[PDB]
Amino acid sequence: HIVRDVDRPGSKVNKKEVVEPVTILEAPPMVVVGIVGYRQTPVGHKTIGTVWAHHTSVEFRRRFYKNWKQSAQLAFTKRKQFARTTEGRLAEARTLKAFEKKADIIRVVAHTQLRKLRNNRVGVKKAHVSEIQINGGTIAQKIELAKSLLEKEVRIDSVFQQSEACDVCAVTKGHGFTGVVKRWGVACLPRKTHRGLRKVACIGAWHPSRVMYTVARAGQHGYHHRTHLNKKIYQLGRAVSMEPNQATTAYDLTAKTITPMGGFVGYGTVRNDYVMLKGSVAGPRRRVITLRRPMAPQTSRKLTEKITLKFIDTSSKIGHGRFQTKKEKSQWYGPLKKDRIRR
Amino acid sequence: AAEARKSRDDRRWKRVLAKMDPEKRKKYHGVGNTAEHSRVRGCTRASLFKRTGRKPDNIVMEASIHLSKLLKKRTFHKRAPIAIKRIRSFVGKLMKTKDNRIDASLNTFIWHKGVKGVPGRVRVRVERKSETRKHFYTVISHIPVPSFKNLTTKVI
RNA sequence: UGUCCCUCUCCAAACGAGAGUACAUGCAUGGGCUGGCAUGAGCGGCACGCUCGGGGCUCGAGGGGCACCGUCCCGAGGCGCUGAACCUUGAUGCUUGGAAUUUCAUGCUCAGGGACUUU
RNA sequence: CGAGUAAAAGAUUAUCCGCGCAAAGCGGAGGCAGUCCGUUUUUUUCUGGGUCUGCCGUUGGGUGGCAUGUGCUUGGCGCU
RNA sequence: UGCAGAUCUUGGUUGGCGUAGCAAAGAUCUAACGGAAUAUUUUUAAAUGCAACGUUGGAUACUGGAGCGGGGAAGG
Ligand SMILES: [Mg+2]
Ligand SMILES: [Mg+2]
Ligand SMILES: [Mg+2]
Ligand SMILES: [Mg+2]
Ligand SMILES: [Mg+2]
Ligand SMILES: [Mg+2]
Ligand SMILES: [Mg+2]
Ligand code: NA
Ligand code: NA
């Protein structure tokens, strides 16, 4: 959580301090490896073709195998032998000509870098692959941007801006098989109920002589895909290796990083770029989440407000943390018994 | 055919990264392989494991087992019998054996605080023997210690 | 050439299914960190103890009992060594890649085994 | 074995590519020897060296960019 | 003296079905011996013989004298 000053004329908190919980997400730079184009038909959009980069990393090619270390690792080997030849160059020009002539949508294939995100608890080593649409400009200009981006890194600060809103797509936490009370929120039954009270008393009338789809039943709860709207961006931080004073504001001059004392529980340390979103996001820790540019109009006073952080909390999330930094804790306690042994 | 000795990319990268070490100010904290309290960059840790022959049939090993992490929120009247099974599987996996004798000294120590009071930590002595294909088996015994601090696995 | 089973992990999980890993700081053990409780056993009473080789410190008890005045003993509790001692990842906290008169260090793997793919 | 593309555009999709409107029109293309088959238009293959680009995997070398242990861009060497 | 049914009579067979279950009286562990019940492979050790039984020694725990103690009547 953080502390900030709000600017909202006519409100009771105008020019006053508030406390807001936030969510921290680690964002290593992505790599662009492909270009795809789409054309419109009376039955929907159809892919035209794909242009691949000449050099791809091992973490990208790990995705196309179930047992990478015990395989022949032959993916993309034939294409590498042909792409840069005279015939290969001609074939690539033919595909790019088709994109210019008859495409409607231009997208780029990108993947994450789990090697740079050196997390001890995230076990997956094969990269996550997805498509990102390119908006703005004519079709020719879209293709020009995609070619310049091929085989290069993209940092999150070049996509989003601070004090902007965004949309979150994620899968929620799972709960397995669940009863109607938790799954749907129905009311419990009196205490004297024979055969149990955590149920729905009547599941239908005599006619129609079947159960309808609108009646609550027991089943799977959680692990669903959801899309949530209008999450403001409170900070776009950079990697701790470059600038260590991540959590230092103009009103709190203490030098500290964004990782709390003792580390995030079950995750560890944040070692790369990161984004601070106001509120909560779906899913547990360590899960991969997609952020996209807003869909709803962004013209309200709440959406256009400028955010200026004043204080950032870094106490331990294990127990009741009461020290902001390691130096603060070692100032409260004097020299302990172990330190006496050392000296 | 699956030899693939290679080990060359490590050679190339280490000679390269040494080449542009000359800078006005280096920074680049760990990029140079000269660093303290750090891993060796460019290769896996398992590549540095010393490979010898197969160990002899007759060996003796001293090891500690953290039992409280294996018995958490377990049903009370099952803790002592479960701990016996966990110790057997712990040792058997290490020694690649299915015959593991428990011996009275270790069995008494596990049960010496009742069925629901299994001690959190234990130190054991494991000896592997063979007799007559050949048959391998293990004998596990108790090693009383005053404290468990600063104790690590040893091979005699 | 590939997929699955056995062995390993948990963002998943009634069983199937899933996310993963395939000698990997992977697993185990220990050390630090961060937290929880609240000051262990043993010994001791103006020093030959504790604290800041030599110099400055500081050191209880309501009562009771032997032995011709002190000395020797029994006594809940209290004080010193002592923010000591113990626990801290396991259905599953951090740390071997920011820096730091200190944060990580050892041990085990030794051609993985099996089924199918008419390819 | 019962053959219909929300595909292309031609010696009936064969007999090369690039630009161009299913235009007008304008550009580029290695050569030599056998063999083996062949109802002609420089006939099909398979073979052999001599060879020249683009390009692999390389021997090392130096310039450099990227978030900095992992791969790239350079620039030569001898190798298909 | 001719059968398809009488909630027909007597035998046999049958889906349901390897299903519903076999959940009061707290609880077993270990080594040696016994046993045909193993340490069972040809096509190094683990990933190809599992699971379970009695006696003795040791450990743990229950009954708790209105006892899963020691004797009788009725009944057997
Ligand atoms: Mg009732
Ligand atoms: Mg907490
Ligand atoms: Mg009849
Ligand atoms: Mg059953
Ligand atoms: Mg029942
Ligand atoms: Mg009782
Ligand atoms: Mg009792
Ligand atoms: Na009832
Ligand atoms: Na009785």
From TrEMBL, chain A:
One of its GO terms (cellular component) is mitochondrial large ribosomal subunit. Mg(2+) 2 binds at K317. One of its GO terms (molecular function) is structural constituent of ribosome. GO terms for biological process: translation. The keyword Transcription does not apply. Keywords: Metal-binding, Ribonucleoprotein, Ribosomal protein. The keyword Metal-binding applies. Belongs to the universal ribosomal protein uL3 family. This is Ribosomal protein L3, mitochondrial, putative. It comes from Trypanosoma brucei brucei (strain 927/4 GUTat10.1). The lineage of its organism: Eukaryota, Discoba, Euglenozoa, Kinetoplastea, Metakinetoplastina. The gene is Tb04.2L9.1340. The chain holds residues 55 to 397 of 429 of the full protein.
From TrEMBL, chain B:
Keywords: Coiled coil, Ribonucleoprotein, Ribosomal protein. Transmembrane segments: none annotated. One of its GO terms (biological process) is cytoplasmic translation. It holds the Pfam family Ribosomal_L31e. The keyword Cell division does not apply. One of its GO terms (molecular function) is structural constituent of ribosome. GO terms for cellular component: cytosolic large ribosomal subunit. Gene3D superfamilies: 3.10.440.10. The keyword Ribonucleoprotein applies. InterPro entries: Ribosomal_eL31, Ribosomal_eL31_dom_sf. PANTHER family: 60S RIBOSOMAL PROTEIN L31 (PTHR10956). Belongs to the eukaryotic ribosomal protein eL31 family. This is 60S ribosomal subunit protein L31, putative. It comes from Trypanosoma brucei brucei (strain 927/4 GUTat10.1). The lineage of its organism: Eukaryota, Discoba, Euglenozoa, Kinetoplastea, Metakinetoplastina.
